Design a protein around this ligand. Sequence first.
Ligand code: VCA
Length: 279
Amino acid sequence: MTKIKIVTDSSVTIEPELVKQLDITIVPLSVMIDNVVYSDADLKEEGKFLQLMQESKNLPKTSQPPVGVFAEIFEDLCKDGGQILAIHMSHALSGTVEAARQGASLSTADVIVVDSSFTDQALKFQVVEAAKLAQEGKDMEAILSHVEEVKNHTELYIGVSTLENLVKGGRIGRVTGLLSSLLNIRVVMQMKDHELQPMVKGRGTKTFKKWLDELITSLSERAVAEIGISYSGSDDWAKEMKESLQAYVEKPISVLETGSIIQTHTGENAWAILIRYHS
Ligand SMILES: CCCCCC/C=C\CCCCCCCCCC(=O)O
């Protein structure tokens, strides 16, 4: 029989070489910059979108992939007779996973669609694990259950230096219980069960450092499988966090610029820590 094929979306943050090595298909979102629509696939060069967003007259606007695009990719991918497992960013952030469900129903292909409950490198954990097992010839039930195990041992922490992109883009509606009379302020949230939960907020330049010290304390008694760090803007703070965190995980930490889809909604000088604990 034909190996299962893994699909995800371009909100995933992943080393490009791993996409090829694992035969992962990435369905691109799009972003409109000063009324010109770019495919996210053309916005992967380091720092390119950051510069565009710094200079554009308008805040960019992100768009999910069309239903019909998923239908056509699913139809092409199944020509080998194999099943498809599509793992996507949370429905709370984007309609992408729902467009995939609809594309699956329109296709003649045998398509399973899974909401990762995250995005960025936390979505990467599930997609990579799925594709590794797919490559080994595992069946759909075995892959789904291992992906779920990964999801359920994953945590996502995100810091932003302004609220304005979250407000304008709308995903502030997913932040539970945040009260700020200021947009320009530092906030650290945990994405848990499709909600952004504020852990702390503050104007000061030490708001992230003190939170980091608390995270590190909490890691003393945890077995950690993988940590990834993502950022928008410069990588200075991300590299600093890596220096403190690398001691807590054997696997080398991936420090990656987040994609245009995320940058549009977080703003510059944002960061994420994506942790996967041992199952
Ligand atoms: C700096 C890296 C941040 C990684 C974690 C990001 C998680 C939550 C923050 C909110 C992100 C919202 C993304 C919205 C994408 C919407 C795409 C669409 O138009 O459907």
